[PDB]
Amino acid sequence: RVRTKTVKKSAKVIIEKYYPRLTLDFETNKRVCDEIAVISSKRLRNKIAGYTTHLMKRIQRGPVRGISFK
Amino acid sequence: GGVTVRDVDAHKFVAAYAAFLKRQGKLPVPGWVDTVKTGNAKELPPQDIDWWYIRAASVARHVYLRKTVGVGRLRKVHGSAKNRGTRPSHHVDASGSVDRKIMQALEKIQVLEKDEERGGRRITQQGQRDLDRIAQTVAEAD
Amino acid sequence: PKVHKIRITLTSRKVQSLEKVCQELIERAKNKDLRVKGPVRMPTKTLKITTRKTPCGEGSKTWDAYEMRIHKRLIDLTAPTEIVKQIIINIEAGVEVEVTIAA
């Protein structure tokens, strides 16, 4: 269960471009991503929302190298 | 309370109706007994002597539960597998004359009548009352 | 002007064009104050063909299954005979329509 580069890049760019509007809850990010992005797959949208909600859990507790937001 | 065919066990009920039909003892027989195979797939005649009467009782039992039935349908209803030799077995139907005439005789005993409007044979007003009457004979027999 | 309770049957392999054909037909009929009956959902007709894949018989033995699907999506209406002629106009390619007066 390892996520590919397309999700890695999309999750990083969404997080750094739009940090505050989305939170640790997975359900909210599910509807946040597809409204502000053009994605051709439902499961891929789930892939992004699931991994992207993981990042803020560890950002909330200490910063992490390789990610920078406004 | 009142009981019907559905309220009694099938195995003992058909035996009871065979015993009841013993006492009337009036169904024509064209002499086919003791000579017929009762089915192409089969090889030996039934051992018990009144198979002509038990089969007719069971046929009248199932026609009570079915709305329209013919000889062709009963042909495959009573069929079974046949040992073709070294080839794998298949499904083939029973003999036609035996099943046709055993129920052709059953109309004139006033149990069921013809259904020429759409086909087949259906059960008659007073015909169903015969199978109904034995239901009470068996129900409180317990 | 005698109503005849027409019924029309449709057939196609693709699904979206046929669906939008019925989708556009239904408002054209409801807005004229015509009693319309719903778009019933007929079973899909699936067809398959199996043949040997290799053309010579050498090597390993492998099969493939071609297939084809057909849908009907029939609709009926209660209207006079002449009015239905102008209501089934402007149909696109592929979809074939057959009309039955059912008088």
Binding site: - | - | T11, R13, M68, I70, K72, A93
Partner: protein, 45 residues
């Protein structure tokens, strides 16, 4: 008067007939596919 299931194969073969003939005839004129629309009592290509 034929069933729909056999009709949908017969007209597919009809399309195949038109497509195959056109390669053998109009190859010089830059042929690239066709499409057929069937209407009652008249057809277009």
């Amino acid at each position: 008067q034929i069933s729909k299931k056999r009709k949908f194969v017969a007209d597919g073969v009809f399309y195949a007939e038109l497509n195959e003939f056109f390669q053998r005839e109009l190859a010089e004129e830059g042929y690239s596919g066709v499409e057929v629309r069937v209407t009652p009592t008249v057809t277009d290509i």
